[PDB]
Design an enzyme around this catalytic site. Sequence first.
Site, PDB file in Angstrom:
ATOM      1  N   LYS A 145       0.812  -1.228   0.000  1.00 11.92           N
ATOM      2  CA  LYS A 145       0.000   0.000   0.000  1.00 11.92           C
ATOM      3  C   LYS A 145       0.843   1.276   0.000  1.00 11.92           C
ATOM      4  CE  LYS A 145      -1.735  -1.729   3.776  1.00 11.92           C
ATOM      5  NZ  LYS A 145      -0.479  -0.966   4.104  1.00 11.92           N
ATOM      6  N   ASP A 170      10.741  -5.489   3.186  1.00 11.16           N
ATOM      7  CA  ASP A 170       9.765  -6.475   2.696  1.00 11.16           C
ATOM      8  C   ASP A 170       9.012  -5.996   1.471  1.00 11.16           C
ATOM      9  OD1 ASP A 170       8.261  -9.142   3.385  1.00 11.16           O
ATOM     10  OD2 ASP A 170       6.604  -7.684   3.027  1.00 11.16           O
ATOM     11  N   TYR A 175       2.524  -6.081  -4.958  1.00  5.06           N
ATOM     12  CA  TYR A 175       2.382  -4.720  -4.410  1.00  5.06           C
ATOM     13  C   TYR A 175       2.577  -3.666  -5.505  1.00  5.06           C
ATOM     14  CZ  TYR A 175       3.116  -7.194   0.070  1.00  5.06           C
ATOM     15  OH  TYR A 175       3.022  -8.076   1.126  1.00  5.06           O
ATOM     16  N   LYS A 183       8.310 -11.937  -2.812  1.00  5.71           N
ATOM     17  CA  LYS A 183       7.383 -13.057  -2.753  1.00  5.71           C
ATOM     18  C   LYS A 183       6.871 -13.418  -4.142  1.00  5.71           C
ATOM     19  CE  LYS A 183       5.915 -10.823   1.576  1.00  5.71           C
ATOM     20  NZ  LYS A 183       5.791  -9.400   1.155  1.00  5.71           N
ATOM     21  N   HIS A 197       3.957 -16.492  -1.596  1.00  3.75           N
ATOM     22  CA  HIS A 197       3.117 -15.453  -1.000  1.00  3.75           C
ATOM     23  C   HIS A 197       1.866 -16.024  -0.346  1.00  3.75           C
ATOM     24  CE1 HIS A 197       2.341 -10.868  -1.356  1.00  3.75           C
ATOM     25  NE2 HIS A 197       1.759 -11.347  -0.267  1.00  3.75           N
ATOM     26  N   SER A 220       4.670 -17.996   3.212  1.00  5.81           N
ATOM     27  CA  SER A 220       3.849 -16.966   3.850  1.00  5.81           C
ATOM     28  C   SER A 220       2.415 -17.464   3.920  1.00  5.81           C
ATOM     29  CB  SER A 220       3.910 -15.658   3.051  1.00  5.81           C
ATOM     30  OG  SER A 220       3.290 -14.599   3.776  1.00  5.81           O
TER      31      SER A 220
HETATM   32  N1  LIG Z   1       2.664 -11.966   3.446  1.00  7.45           N
HETATM   33  C1  LIG Z   1       1.498 -11.328   3.331  1.00  7.45           C
HETATM   34  O1  LIG Z   1       0.507 -11.880   2.867  1.00  7.45           O
HETATM   35  C2  LIG Z   1       1.382  -9.907   3.829  1.00  7.45           C
HETATM   36  C3  LIG Z   1       0.124  -9.367   4.024  1.00  7.45           C
HETATM   37  C4  LIG Z   1       0.024  -8.060   4.485  1.00  7.45           C
HETATM   38  C5  LIG Z   1       1.193  -7.347   4.745  1.00  7.45           C
HETATM   39  N2  LIG Z   1       2.416  -7.879   4.534  1.00  7.45           N
HETATM   40  C6  LIG Z   1       3.633  -7.091   4.784  1.00  7.45           C
HETATM   41  O2  LIG Z   1       3.646  -6.553   6.119  1.00  7.45           O
HETATM   42  C7  LIG Z   1       3.773  -5.123   6.042  1.00  7.45           C
HETATM   43  C8  LIG Z   1       3.077  -4.400   7.192  1.00  7.45           C
HETATM   44  O3  LIG Z   1       1.692  -4.731   7.218  1.00  7.45           O
HETATM   45  P1  LIG Z   1       0.525  -3.703   6.727  1.00  7.45           P
HETATM   46  O4  LIG Z   1       1.024  -2.761   5.641  1.00  7.45           O
HETATM   47  O5  LIG Z   1      -0.680  -4.578   6.415  1.00  7.45           O
HETATM   48  O6  LIG Z   1       0.081  -2.827   7.999  1.00  7.45           O
HETATM   49  P2  LIG Z   1       0.860  -2.314   9.307  1.00  7.45           P
HETATM   50  O7  LIG Z   1       2.366  -2.148   9.163  1.00  7.45           O
HETATM   51  O8  LIG Z   1       0.282  -3.064  10.489  1.00  7.45           O
HETATM   52  O9  LIG Z   1       0.186  -0.840   9.395  1.00  7.45           O
HETATM   53  C9  LIG Z   1       0.533   0.187   8.449  1.00  7.45           C
HETATM   54  C10 LIG Z   1      -0.276   1.450   8.748  1.00  7.45           C
HETATM   55  O10 LIG Z   1       0.131   1.940  10.022  1.00  7.45           O
HETATM   56  C11 LIG Z   1       0.515   3.308   9.908  1.00  7.45           C
HETATM   57  N3  LIG Z   1       1.645   3.514  10.827  1.00  7.45           N
HETATM   58  C12 LIG Z   1       2.897   3.046  10.652  1.00  7.45           C
HETATM   59  N4  LIG Z   1       3.697   3.393  11.696  1.00  7.45           N
HETATM   60  C13 LIG Z   1       2.946   4.116  12.542  1.00  7.45           C
HETATM   61  C14 LIG Z   1       3.178   4.790  13.837  1.00  7.45           C
HETATM   62  N5  LIG Z   1       4.405   4.745  14.403  1.00  7.45           N
HETATM   63  N6  LIG Z   1       2.140   5.426  14.424  1.00  7.45           N
HETATM   64  C15 LIG Z   1       0.923   5.461  13.845  1.00  7.45           C
HETATM   65  N7  LIG Z   1       0.630   4.873  12.661  1.00  7.45           N
HETATM   66  C16 LIG Z   1       1.591   4.194  11.974  1.00  7.45           C
HETATM   67  C17 LIG Z   1       0.869   3.558   8.454  1.00  7.45           C
HETATM   68  O11 LIG Z   1       0.584   4.911   8.068  1.00  7.45           O
HETATM   69  P3  LIG Z   1       1.564   5.728   7.060  1.00  7.45           P
HETATM   70  O12 LIG Z   1       2.162   4.709   6.125  1.00  7.45           O
HETATM   71  O13 LIG Z   1       0.624   6.667   6.348  1.00  7.45           O
HETATM   72  O14 LIG Z   1       2.596   6.368   7.961  1.00  7.45           O
HETATM   73  C18 LIG Z   1      -0.059   2.594   7.757  1.00  7.45           C
HETATM   74  O15 LIG Z   1      -1.329   3.240   7.520  1.00  7.45           O
HETATM   75  C19 LIG Z   1       3.123  -4.776   4.715  1.00  7.45           C
HETATM   76  O16 LIG Z   1       3.440  -3.467   4.223  1.00  7.45           O
HETATM   77  C20 LIG Z   1       3.661  -5.888   3.852  1.00  7.45           C
HETATM   78  O17 LIG Z   1       5.031  -5.560   3.585  1.00  7.45           O
HETATM   79  C21 LIG Z   1       2.513  -9.137   4.089  1.00  7.45           C
HETATM   80  O1  LIG Z   2      -6.809  -7.989  -3.130  1.00  7.10           O
HETATM   81  C1  LIG Z   2      -6.559  -9.090  -2.703  1.00  7.10           C
HETATM   82  C2  LIG Z   2      -5.365  -9.425  -1.908  1.00  7.10           C
HETATM   83  C3  LIG Z   2      -4.450  -8.504  -1.617  1.00  7.10           C
HETATM   84  C4  LIG Z   2      -3.214  -8.677  -0.851  1.00  7.10           C
HETATM   85  C5  LIG Z   2      -2.299  -7.644  -0.727  1.00  7.10           C
HETATM   86  C6  LIG Z   2      -1.087  -7.823  -0.093  1.00  7.10           C
HETATM   87  C7  LIG Z   2      -0.761  -9.070   0.452  1.00  7.10           C
HETATM   88  O2  LIG Z   2       0.463  -9.270   1.010  1.00  7.10           O
HETATM   89  C8  LIG Z   2      -1.692 -10.106   0.368  1.00  7.10           C
HETATM   90  O3  LIG Z   2      -1.422 -11.301   0.980  1.00  7.10           O
HETATM   91  C9  LIG Z   2      -2.898  -9.933  -0.277  1.00  7.10           C
HETATM   92  O4  LIG Z   2      -7.383 -10.141  -2.921  1.00  7.10           O
HETATM   93  C10 LIG Z   2      -8.598  -9.895  -3.682  1.00  7.10           C
HETATM   94  C11 LIG Z   2      -9.431 -11.173  -3.740  1.00  7.10           C
HETATM   95  C12 LIG Z   2      -8.994 -12.164  -4.797  1.00  7.10           C
HETATM   96  C13 LIG Z   2      -7.668 -12.553  -4.909  1.00  7.10           C
HETATM   97  C14 LIG Z   2      -7.271 -13.470  -5.869  1.00  7.10           C
HETATM   98  C15 LIG Z   2      -8.197 -14.012  -6.732  1.00  7.10           C
HETATM   99  C16 LIG Z   2      -9.517 -13.636  -6.636  1.00  7.10           C
HETATM  100  C17 LIG Z   2      -9.913 -12.718  -5.675  1.00  7.10           C
END
Ligand SMILES: NC(=O)c1ccc[n+]([C@@H]2O[C@H](COP(=O)([O-])OP(=O)(O)OC[C@H]3O[C@@H](n4cnc5c(N)ncnc54)[C@H](OP(=O)(O)O)[C@@H]3O)[C@@H](O)[C@H]2O)c1
Ligand SMILES: O=C(/C=C/c1ccc(O)c(O)c1)OCCc1ccccc1
Length: 318
Positions: A24, A46, A51, A80, A113, A162
């Site tokens: 994001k 990461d 993405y 990933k 992933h 993952s």
């Molecule tokens: N393997 C997978 O399937 C998977 C799935 C989801 C995520 N991930 C990875 O994990 C990473 C982190 O997870 P996530 O992006 O879902 O969410 P997250 O890191 O839990 O939360 C990000 C949000 O928190 C805000 N934020 C960050 N630091 C802050 C602080 N010190 N105080 C207040 N707010 C804060 C950010 O705002 P701003 O950015 O506007 O500062 C952003 O809106 C992802 O970016 C991705 O790399 C992997």
């Molecule tokens: O937008 C999504 C998933 C987003 C997302 C982003 C970051 C991640 O790290 C992650 O693990 C997942 O999924 C949409 C639903 C879908 C997906 C596949 C086929 C049909 C329908």
Amino acid sequence: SHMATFVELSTKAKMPIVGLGTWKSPLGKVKEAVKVAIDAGYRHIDCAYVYQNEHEVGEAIQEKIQEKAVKREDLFIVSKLWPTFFERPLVRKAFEKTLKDLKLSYLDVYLIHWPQGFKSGDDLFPKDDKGNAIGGKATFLDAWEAMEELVDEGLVKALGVSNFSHFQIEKLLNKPGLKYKPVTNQVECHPYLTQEKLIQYCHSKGITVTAYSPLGSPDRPWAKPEDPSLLEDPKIKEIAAKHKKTAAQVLIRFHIQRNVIVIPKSVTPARIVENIQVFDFKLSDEEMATILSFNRNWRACNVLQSSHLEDYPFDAEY
Ligand SMILES: NC(=O)c1ccc[n+]([C@@H]2O[C@H](COP(=O)([O-])OP(=O)(O)OC[C@H]3O[C@@H](n4cnc5c(N)ncnc54)[C@H](OP(=O)(O)O)[C@@H]3O)[C@@H](O)[C@H]2O)c1
Ligand SMILES: O=C(/C=C/c1ccc(O)c(O)c1)OCCc1ccccc1
């Protein structure tokens, strides 16, 4: 200025316990975000093909490398493989686009992933007329075999998974002709989803755990106002106030003291710095037990409702 503690992988490689998440992180902002992170002392980034901002991540990394701000061997870049690319020649193709985008000659870790194979093609999210996911033909086991070739060729230093349950990891580990073991399993983890049994399982097998969405991913598109909010949780903030820290810093330190790698995302420079300023305090034992007691098995990342396909990870207890 800052350095995250090293977590040692089964390969002896050193994985920094805090990294920068990039999901994001909008185009036009992620490049500066990664530069700020690198300047502050982040080494673990990461990333993911899905993405769709990897090339801007690569510009940032390549710049910092050019300025001699950091050397490649000290960086720890993870990306990933997305399940629409499980077929052997597509694995190689997705990996090549990822590597070109990141302007690197190798990845430190390459993850599967998601365990379910999705229909190969143009679409990243192939759906039916009811919007359900369309499965594909190759399995994550097929994918792993192709990925192992990346390691053989020196293109990737290590492989991981993952969103796998222990059942799926078991399947991988017992696969005939297995060449390389997963060094990590990257799953959602935080005080509302503490993942005790899965963390126990992974550690018992010498597999690290990387915690994603550790702040509750408040910027996830599908967030609903009724949904729980970690950053606003009053008990969290109270504990933060005790240490003259922010709620975010507590939510990050939480994983560190369970020896879990954690990857908070931000594109805000002040927050990026704040999120790595977490090696100058300790949560007390009773503070950890209190934070653990917040488990409600709640997933912020469960928009993939592909529960009809084989290998849906979230049906299993862990
Ligand atoms: N393997 C997978 O399937 C998977 C799935 C989801 C995520 N991930 C990875 O994990 C990473 C982190 O997870 P996530 O992006 O879902 O969410 P997250 O890191 O839990 O939360 C990000 C949000 O928190 C805000 N934020 C960050 N630091 C802050 C602080 N010190 N105080 C207040 N707010 C804060 C950010 O705002 P701003 O950015 O506007 O500062 C952003 O809106 C992802 O970016 C991705 O790399 C992997
Ligand atoms: O937008 C999504 C998933 C987003 C997302 C982003 C970051 C991640 O790290 C992650 O693990 C997942 O999924 C949409 C639903 C879908 C997906 C596949 C086929 C049909 C329908």
